Amino acid sequence: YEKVRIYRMDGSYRSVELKHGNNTTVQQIMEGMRLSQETQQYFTIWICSENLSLQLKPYHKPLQHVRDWPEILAELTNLDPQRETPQLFLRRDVRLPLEVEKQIEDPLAILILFDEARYNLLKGFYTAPDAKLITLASLLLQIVYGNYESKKHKQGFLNEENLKSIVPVTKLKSKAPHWTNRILHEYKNLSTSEGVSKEMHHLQRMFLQNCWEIPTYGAAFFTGQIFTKNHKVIPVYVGVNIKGLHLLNMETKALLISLKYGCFMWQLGDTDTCFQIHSMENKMSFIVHTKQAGLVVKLLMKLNGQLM
Amino acid sequence: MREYKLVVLGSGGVGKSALTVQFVQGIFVEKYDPTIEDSYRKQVEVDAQQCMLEILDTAGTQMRDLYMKNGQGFALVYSITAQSTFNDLQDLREQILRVKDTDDVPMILVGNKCDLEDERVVGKEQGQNLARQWNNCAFLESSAKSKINVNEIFYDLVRQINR
Ligand SMILES: Nc1nc2c(ncn2[C@@H]2O[C@H](COP(=O)(O)OP(=O)(O)NP(=O)(O)O)[C@@H](O)[C@H]2O)c(=O)[nH]1
Ligand SMILES: *Cc1c(O)ccc2cc(-c3ccco3)ccc12
Ligand SMILES: [Mg+2]
């Protein structure tokens, strides 16, 4: 029989039988997982290589996307396909309303969402102030390392090797080493406070609660370029989520602009290779050049239309 | 952070997945979904060391030769309610030593479903007796449902790999 590995962001995977070979659909693969109809509604199958991630649809055949990946890369990116082998992932549905996520109680759905959120945080895709990042680091210490012990954690426990797993990689160098005392204090408060539940799925939901207010939470990230007003090229990540549109500098992950639905407008370029954004009251306009502009605008239209 | 490659082997239905999922995710898997091949990752602390565990959850039937070539520690699980699953582990122990070409292989004998004390078919002494023949191999009676002897299955394999 045929089988495929469905990965998650932490490196784990689950093998699923392909009853219909490469004609098997996302819907049929989702049924092959160990997910109830409660756990299943929050997630879907993505196909991602190192520099292109695509959320698939229930009717899509993911193995044919793997087969056609060099042509998909050439249509949506300017990458060379020889360094990009795609894999199939189980990830949060980009259309999942935040209001629906906030009502989730299932421990498995929480851990899957938590693991994806932690992956985005450590990679730097979550832009947030220092206090929010320090709180997230303290929760990761409780989740991963357990209860705080002064014997074990008070001094020289938060080296770069241990700091890397609790803070964004973009802050690990010139910001995180100044955070250790504030991180351990909140870590100690978490453990010594019996008013907060040490249940695993309860701690993971606390982590997500802090992530739900980050502007880029749950965003699908596309790749593009903008030109500076005397013109310089700036590679950017184009993040589209249920809140709106966000631009990150590709090199630094710094948040260039964050726009909520109803405060900006979009228009697809005539050549499909770009889209323009008009902000309200900001009275400014920028254009993002990307071969994914056709997907960015379509996703923007659906996620805007979802909000009532 | 040192990486540890652990492999959970045994016949079907013994609770290989339920033990792994309880350990990694803290959930008790109730439904019986026969495994093809699942892999899990989990960071733990064994003897003041941060360890990255890669736990391979295998099929009750089967690619078995590759699991043993690559795996560093092996949990051999049976159900105390099924005699045949106990009998099957002798071949697994012997085949592991064959692929490794040595008897010094990190290994633990696990009698699962010890919460079903009434449905017990395999006694505790018979399990200890088996681990004795296996060059004084580690032995635990565990329960994925009651969270009894779950973490120390994998902690003990880490310690055996470190020695
Ligand atoms: N009462 C009880 N039931 C258990 C225990 N461990 C597993 N089970 C039950 O036994 C059944 C089979 O468990 P499972 O983990 O799928 O075993 P498996 O070895 O992974 N099967 P396979 O080899 O086909 O993948 C499930 O219904 C599960 O709930 C236990 O400690 N106590
Ligand atoms: C066209 C469409 C609809 O209808 C729903 C969801 C979509 C998601 C994407 C996407 C997510 C990550 C990358 O692309 C694209 C199109 C979608
Ligand atoms: Mg199993």
Residue numbers in the entry:
A (entry chain A): 419 to 647, 652 to 730
B (entry chain B): 1 to 62, 67 to 167
From the reporting publication:
Herein, we characterize the 2-hydroxy-1-naphthaldehyde (HNA) fragment as a targeted covalent reversible ligand of a noncatalytic lysine (Lys720) of the Krev interaction trapped 1 (KRIT1) protein. The PPI between HEG1 and KRIT1 is believed to play an important role in controlling vascular development and permeability under normal and pathological conditions. The HEG1 binding domain of KRIT1 features three lysines, namely Lys475, Lys720, and Lys724; based on point mutation studies, these residues are essential for the interaction between HEG1 and KRIT1.14 The HNA was found to form a reversible imine adduct with Lys720, and SAR studies indicated that the HNA is the smallest/simplest 2-hydroxy-arylaldehyde that inhibits the HEG1-KRIT1 PPI. However, the interaction of HNA within the HEG1 binding pocket of KRIT1 induces proximity of the aldehyde moiety with the ε-amino group of Lys720, resulting in the specific targeting of this amino acid residue.
The C6 and C7 positions were selected for substitutions as an analysis of the available HNA-KRIT1 co-crystal structure indicated that these two positions may provide opportunities for analogs with improved complementarity to the HEG1 binding region of KRIT1. The co-crystal structures of 3, 5, and 6 in complex with KRIT1 revealed that these compounds exhibit similar binding modes as the parent HNA fragment, including the presence of the imine adduct between the aldehyde moiety of the HNA derivative and the ε-amino group of Lys720. Additionally, both furan derivatives 5 and 6 were involved in hydrogen−π interactions with KRIT1 Gln473.
